[PDB]
Amino acid sequence: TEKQLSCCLDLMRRLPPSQIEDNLAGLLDLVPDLTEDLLSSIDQPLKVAYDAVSKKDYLLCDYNRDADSYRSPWSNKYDPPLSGACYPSSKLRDIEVQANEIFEIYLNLYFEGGVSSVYCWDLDDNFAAVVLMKKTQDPMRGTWDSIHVVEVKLGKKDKAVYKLTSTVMLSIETDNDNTGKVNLAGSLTRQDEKEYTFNEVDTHCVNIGKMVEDMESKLRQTLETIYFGKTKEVVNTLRNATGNS
Amino acid sequence: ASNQELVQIATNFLLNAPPCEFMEVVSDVRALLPSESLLNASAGSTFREYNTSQMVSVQTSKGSALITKEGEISNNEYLDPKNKQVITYDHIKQEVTGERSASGEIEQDIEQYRAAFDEEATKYCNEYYPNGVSAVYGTKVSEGIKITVCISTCIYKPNAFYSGRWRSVWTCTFKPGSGNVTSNGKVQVNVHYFEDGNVQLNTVTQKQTTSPSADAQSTAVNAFKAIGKAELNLHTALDNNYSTMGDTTFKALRRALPINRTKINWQKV
């Protein structure tokens, strides 16, 4: 129902971001015939899991999920274990391993901590993937969650089009005797499509990294303008500190 | 999954709608309810909770007024001391349905204090809140007199994708003629920006000030000098906080550039 999906998306853009988890579940209860679309177009902060085989942490999202289990990008195994699950094709898995390796580097360079995760899924002869970043800095605390869904459509010979839909979820919260309890929470999305020649030098992972880097660097500046400039601007039009004098 | 569970889900959406966008949220919800009758028993109480906690403003024949819990006489009747009237309000349609003169709701024995405070709240409101609407109530309490000051102002520019509201509720208690006035304030600020996303600022601050309780005129003037100072400081603190957050926690999340100021060489690495 385009009408209901339309109202869900609009509703989620108005409701408090901090209650997104409870609110999304609520919608699923209200309109289960939209469970797939909802789980797909509405994002929220991701939970961290531990891969005991690889001795590394990984991110949980609807992209590495099958039933109630989650696939680890490092071991390619599900937890809890289950039969009949979905795994990337042999060739796509090789790309997934390379992707996870470079983005963990990207993580080190742009976050200096946190956790990363990339999951790929076959789309016939084509494929798509999600690049995930999560970082929490520590009274004043903040949390950053990045999700980049990349869609790759091979184009005849050595040239492919990369479609990117990126979302960054950012929250900062402080509570003191000067300002009282202050909470900033939300997210911003931006898209970008681009064609690239992919070789053994300019691999898909390379083309995805360039697009992810540019996109996340642009969202960063927009986040900064809005979170610390636009909101401030609004408050100051609600209350004129110097007063009409 | 039960009808009542589905009812509680929708109630929570409604109660959490951002300022000035209540109707946009009410539409989305109604369109998600399998049956418009599901909330035909919870609505009134639900909308009333939102309207009064948001301290929405209304237009009467004598000017603007506020719909608050402190001025609530009945489930649909609100007192407006300034214009000596009782406003009947329809919480579901969000519109005034009645206007009459007060006939005893206002406590005359302390009205000189309420009136002296009202003059100050009005000027203060006109000075620091461009679209602000105020409301000053009064009542006798064990310790003497309680004067409640409510201020509420919002903004809505859907074309610019943003909205906001500032709510201040200062409760001033004092023994008439001597002693001090103890003013407890609760300020709440809300901002919603939704262009290609949804970002929200939510604040809740509680403060307490003290000032001399003498002749009505003075008691009011000095209470507002204190209240105005407290809010100025809070406003200042809020402006500073923006910088702190964006210059500390924010930069401590994702660098603008790697430690060696260079965009990754993807061919390598």
Numbering used by the authors:
A (entry chain B): 2 to 139, 146 to 252
B (entry chain A): 2 to 270
From the paper:
Capping protein (CP), also known as CapZ in muscle cells and Cap32/34 in Dictyostelium discoideum, plays a major role in regulating actin filament dynamics. CP is a ubiquitously expressed heterodimer comprising an α- and β-subunit. It tightly binds to the fast growing end of actin filaments, thereby functioning as a “cap” by blocking the addition and loss of actin subunits. Vertebrates contain two somatic variants of CP, one being primarily found at the cell periphery of non-muscle tissues while the other is mainly localized at the Z-discs of skeletal muscles.
We here report the first high resolution structure of a cytoplasmic CP. The overall structure of Cap32/34 from Dictyostelium discoideum reveals a similar arrangement as compared to its sarcomeric variant CapZ. Superposition of the two Cap32/34 molecules within the asymmetric unit revealed only small deviations in their overall structures, with a root-mean-square deviation (r.m.s.d.) of 0.3 Å for 512 common Cα atoms. Briefly, Cap32/34 has the shape of a mushroom, comprising a stalk (“N-stalk”) and a cap (“central β-sheet” and “antiparallel H5s”). The mushroom stalk is composed of six anti-parallel α-helices, of which three are contributed from the N-terminus of each subunit (H1–3). The cap consists of a single ten-stranded antiparallel β-sheet formed by five β-strands of each subunit (S6–10). In Cap34 the region located opposite to the C-terminal β-tentacle moves towards the antiparallel helices that interconnect the heterodimer leading to a more compact CP structure. In contrast to the α-tentacle, neither Cap32/34 nor CapZ crystals grown at physiological pH provided an interpretable electron density for the C-terminal segment of the β-subunit (β-tentacle), indicating that this part of the CP molecule is highly mobile. The sequence alignment further reveals that Lys-142 and Lys-143 of Cap32 are C-terminally flanked by three additional residues (Gly-144, Gln-145, Pro-146) resulting in an elongated linker region. Since “linker βS7–S8” provides a positively charged surface close to the basic patch on CP, it might participate in the initial electrostatic binding to acidic regions on the barbed end of actin filaments.
